[PDB]
Amino acid sequence: XXXXXXXXXXXXXXXXXXXXXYXXXXXXXXXXXXXXXXXXXXXXXXXXXXXXXXXXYXXXXXXXXXXXXXXXXXXXXXXXXXXXXXXXXXXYXXXXXXXXXXXXX
C-alpha cells in the first residue's frame, strides 16, 4: 500500500548484506594509486650490484694503480754491470798487458 520503514529497512539490510558493492568500492578504487618510492628494498639491489661485478671491483683498483708500476736502478742490472766488467776481455787483459809489457827491464 506504501513505501515504508519495512521496505526501507529491507533495502538497508540488503545494502548491509551486499559485500560486492562496498568492498569493490573501497578496494578496487584504492588499488590504482598504489605506489611511489625509491624503495629501500631496491637500495639492497643497488648495493648488491655494487658488490656484484668485476668491472667495478677489479678495474677500480687495477686500472688506477697498475698504471704506475716502476722505478729502480735494478739490482738485476747490478748483475749485468758486474758481468760486463768481468767479461770486458779487451779492458782487463790489454790494460794489464800494455801496463806490464811496456817495461822491459
Q: Does 39 bind other proteins (CB under 8 A)?
A: yes
Rounded to an integer, what is the distance from CA 85 to the centroid of its chain?
52
Q: Does 34 bind other proteins (CB under 8 A)?
A: yes
How many angstroms separate the CA atoms of 93 and 87, rounded?
Answer: 10
Closest CA to 8 of 19, 21, 16: 16
Which of residues 1, 2, 20, 101 is near other proteins by CB under 8 A? 101
What is the chain's length? Answer: 105
The DSSP symbol for 66 reads: T
Binding residues for other proteins, rule: CB under 8 A, are 5-6, 9, 13, 16-17, 19, 22-23, 26-27, 30-32, 34-41, 43-45, 48-49, 51-55, 57-58, 60-62, 65-67, 69-76, 78-80, 83-84, 86-90, 92-93, 96-97, 100-101, 103-105
